[PDB]
Design a binder for this molecule. Structure first.
Ligand SMILES: Nc1ncnc2c1ncn2[C@@H]1O[C@H](COP(=O)(O)OP(=O)(O)OP(=O)(O)O)[C@@H](O)[C@H]1O
Ligand SMILES: Nc1ncnc2c1ncn2[C@@H]1O[C@H](COP(=O)(O)OP(=O)(O)O)[C@@H](O)[C@H]1O
Ligand SMILES: [Mg+2]
Ligand SMILES: [Mg+2]
Lengths: 55, 458, 85, 460
């Protein structure tokens, strides 16, 4: 029974690491869409300032 | 006497003889084809040129038209003659009915009441709505703002507040439509006439089809009517359909007025233009104004200048979240961002204050756990952390409520919930009396008794 | 009426607006960009029979006229939260 | 006679019209009566015909269109040499300590060209500071330039006070202190500190406090350099301390828009790299004499990307980076070992003993920063027992780099410590090997030598 529970631990961990890997892969893409918005917005702001300051 | 000398969008420049130049905020008048157009004076330039905003469509204006100088500001009807009627920004009747039986007209540009005139009040005003008067209760004579993005629920919430407050309240009311939908103006007017409550309500409409000068000054037409009823010594309810449109119509004209852009391209005057409007909406030792304002949040960005400036103006602030609304929890109030000046142990008393701070503490801790849960899943939590989650999720559902105005969407019938039942329900959930019920038992139930009856049938 | 890609109308008011040197707002659209779409769309309406009778000069009576509209907008990366959407 | 007239005043910038045959040269000084007070203007630009654009060395308040302006045919000239020592002067070189007239024999223009390429020297004699992380990670040399980088509230000032205590009292030579854009409170406390410790007679201080008009802060650093260059050209070895280099660049930003320049970058003046280079390239050690300098550098919002801190990094020789991320833990001195560096850290100066010890410490702290990311989500049990051991000995080394300063007892309440370089090296080797694997982490924190970390463990 001890040995068969140990085999079940490794099986349950294998599956839990599948979810952790897919969850991490799902978060990275949402952080990247959020970053590209910030990347684009800051370029767009600072050119509005440079052109406005060339009064 | 005057001549038009430029026309740039909504803005018209007029030249006058230098002995006769109109004052700031004077009304001018000009014949535009087969109709009469009013212009409002904004700036005196040099050489007798004066710069003005058109209260109407500026197309078909030539240069060289003769302009007539009216010796006074824009003045609107006020008093009981305005009750039960729909009016233009210029105070013209917009319903098909006859002329307005005015006895007096008031200029829409006024000074705010002096610091000596103001009055304090702590009379809590009840609402039907579990989250609002639990988390962000408000007083008679105070200001409330509903903040949200596009489509989150600002108007449905204000329509429950009209239903709950403005029909158990007995005095007069003013509804100002500012840059919102014309369909929703017509829909609201008919339900007032069908309910025969119309004869207590004044309606000013300058909806989003109207050119910028209408959208900008219709707010001031709305306040000037409410200030007449307040100075008469009444208690008045003022509803403003979207305050953000007042600022945006300022942005649209500001470049044509020749003002350098500020910040995210706003007018440089944004905080003064908002402040001079907002300070007039105050209860006074002579009489009271209770105010509810919807506040559109552009691109859901609560840090944009226009939302940010509005937050200091108001006594209770309710923030609506797209992320919650897409769950289908309604009203989509964010309880970690909604707040009120009235959530204070002295005015609410301790049981209410402790319940609200308990709910706020559990829901904050659930936000702290969600980044763990998102990667690892919930099984990795501690058995107390799992109990915080198991309670917080119930609390988020019990904040939901069926509205009487929402029956055309949800179908299920509306509920009115007492403050005694709301604090008792959340205090019972946090004490854990109900930890044997499922989450679905709490969703869209009026009171905690209704949750246990729903739980019997799951 | 179907309007296809009101996103492309918006992008072409920005071109005209920027060529005329008008100060840009959020992203690069002018502040007038809300008035652009709202004046357009608010014209799609159902009108009561009293309006139809007045417009027609009484030739048509008791009929309510209508104009439904289906505007199309295109979102980058499914982002519902951008300015024009 | 006075020969020009004020024709505009906008903020700090004043335009003056002279006759078309006697136009002031660029950087000439000009003089005007602002009521009772005499005011000086510095010429920035010649533009149009006869008109010159100038910065006020004082308040514009009370200036009128029409005032007569005198043309002084020289730039701003300041007193230099021994007469300066023990005195406090403003940007114009006027006494501000009430002690009376400076009593100079010579005055020098604050604008001068840098040393030519043939005059420079490479005499990298190692210099001991007594601070563990600096002497190991970022060793100084005599005649070099040192920068203390950091955002607000991270320890640049008390680090500079510690460096002033240790080297500048020992130095046996003159020192200049430039208070560029400094808080008036701290300039007072430094003056009394130098007086009460009785070393003020060695040191001359130039102060340009924040309240001063933008013109003063723009030029006060050049007044400090000009005094240090006089002592260098005598052939002395001098120490130059600069309160904050950033504030010179910021004063340039304030005037630059009014001087009609178009903006650049993060709204900085276009000339930012030229203005930085023209100041920094005078602070060098020639064949006649050496200037050793320590400069504090403000880093806006701790963003080391920002053009003003990013540009100055190229001009220094040792750079110490103070991080709020460390400072948040209270572990002062808050020097980041993985970002601080020096030109002197190579085996041909330091010797291999020191070089190997510093590269070792860098490799361990680098490894641990990757391991720390695993731990926070997965926990520490998921490591190899060797990665657990590195996480242990790294987390100790992180604490052992801390050291209490006897200029910080008022904050800490505890006695400050000095360490030799020899003892510093031996201590880090001992954590990198096994000798102290058994002490707790808290037994290192703000200790002093390794030889007393065992004692705090026994107390802990
Ligand atoms: N309590 C509620 N119950 C059911 N549906 C709701 C509720 N609140 C909002 N909704 C839904 O949200 C949608 C839009 O809400 P609402 O019309 O109030 O937003 P709005 O304030 O007009 O937003 P905007 O003014 O930006 O258009 C409606 O379909 C409404 O059904
Ligand atoms: N070595 C240190 N020991 C103790 N406290 C320190 C130390 N360095 C910084 N601090 C704390 O940080 C504060 C600000 O650091 P300071 O150097 O005075 O500011 P700045 O870094 O902006 O010049 C000090 O007042 C003290 O509270
Ligand atoms: Mg709405
Ligand atoms: Mg400092």
């Amino acid at each position: 029974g001890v040995v068969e529970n140990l085999a079940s631990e490794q099986a349950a961990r294998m599956v839990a690491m599948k979810a952790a890997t897919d969850n991490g892969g799902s978060l990275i893409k949402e952080l990247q869409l959020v970053y590209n918005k910030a990347r684009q917005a800051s370029i767009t702001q600072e050119l509005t300032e440079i052109v406005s300051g060339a009064a | 006497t005057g001549k038009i000398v430029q026309v740039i969008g909504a803005v018209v420049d007029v030249e006058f003889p230098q002995d006769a130049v109109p004052r700031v905020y004077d009304a001018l008048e000009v014949q535009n084809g087969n109709e009469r157009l009013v212009l409002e004076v904004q700036q005196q330039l040099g050489g007798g040129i004066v710069r003005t905003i058109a209260m109407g469509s500026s197309d078909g204006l030539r240069r060289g038209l003769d302009v007539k100088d009216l010796e006074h500001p824009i003045e609107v009807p006020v008093g009981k003659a305005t009750l039960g009627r729909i009016m233009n920004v210029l105070g013209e009747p917009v319903d098909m009915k006859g002329e307005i039986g005015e006895e007096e007209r008031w200029a829409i540009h006024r000074a705010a009441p002096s610091y000596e005139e103001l009055s304090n009040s702590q009379e809590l005003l009840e609402t039907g709505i579990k989250v609002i008067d639990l988390m962000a209760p408000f007083a008679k004579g105070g200001k409330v703002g509903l903040f949200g993005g596009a489509g989150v629920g600002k108007t449905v919430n204000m329509m429950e507040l009209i239903r709950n407050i403005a029909i158990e309240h007995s005095g007069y009311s003013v509804f100002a439509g500012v840059g919102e939908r014309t369909r929703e103006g017509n829909d609201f007017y008919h339900e007032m006439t069908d309910s025969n409550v119309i004869d207590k309500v004044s309606l000013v409409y300058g909806q989003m089809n109207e050119p910028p000068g209408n959208r900008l000054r219709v707010a001031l037409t709305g306040l000037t009517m409410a200030e007449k009823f307040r100075d008469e010594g009444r208690d008045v309810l003022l509803f403003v359909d979207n305050i953000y449109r007042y600022t945006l119509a300022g942005t649209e004209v500001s470049a044509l007025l020749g003002r350098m852009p500020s910040a995210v391209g706003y007018q440089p005057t944004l905080a003064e233009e908002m402040g001079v409007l907002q300070e007039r909406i105050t209860s006074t030792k002579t009489g009271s104004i209770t105010s509810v304002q919807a506040v559109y949040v552009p691109a859901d960005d609560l840090t944009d200048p226009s939302p940010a400036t509005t937050f200091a103006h108001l006594d209770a602030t309710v923030v609506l979240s797209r992320q919650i609304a897409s769950l289908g929890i309604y009203p989509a109030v964010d309880p970690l961002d909604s707040t009120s000046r009235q959530l204070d142990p002295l005015v609410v008393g301790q049981e209410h204050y402790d319940t609200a701070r308990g709910v706020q503490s559990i829901l904050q801790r659930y936000q702290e756990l969600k980044d763990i849960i998102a990667i690892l899943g919930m099984d990795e939590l501690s058995e107390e952390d799992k109990l915080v989650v198991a309670r917080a999720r119930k609390i988020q559902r019990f904040l939901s409520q069926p509205f009487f105005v929402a029956e055309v969407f949800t179908g299920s019938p509306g509920k009115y919930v007492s403050l005694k039942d709301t604090i008792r329900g959340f205090k019972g959930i946090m004490e854990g009396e109900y930890d044997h019920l499922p989450e679905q038992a709490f969703y869209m139930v009026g009171s905690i008794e209704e949750a246990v009856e729903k739980a019997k049938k799951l | 009426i179907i309007y296809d890609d009101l996103s492309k109308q918006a992008v072409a008011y920005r071109q005209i607006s920027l060529l005329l040197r008008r100060p840009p707002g959020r992203e690069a659209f002018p502040g007038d960009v809300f008035y652009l779409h709202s004046r357009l769309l608010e014209r799609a309406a159902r009108v009561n029979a009293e309006y139809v009778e007045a417009f027609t000069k009484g030739e048509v009576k008791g009929k309510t006229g209508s104009l439904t509209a289906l505007p199309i907008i295109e979102t980058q990366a499914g982002d519902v939260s951008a300015f024009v959407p």
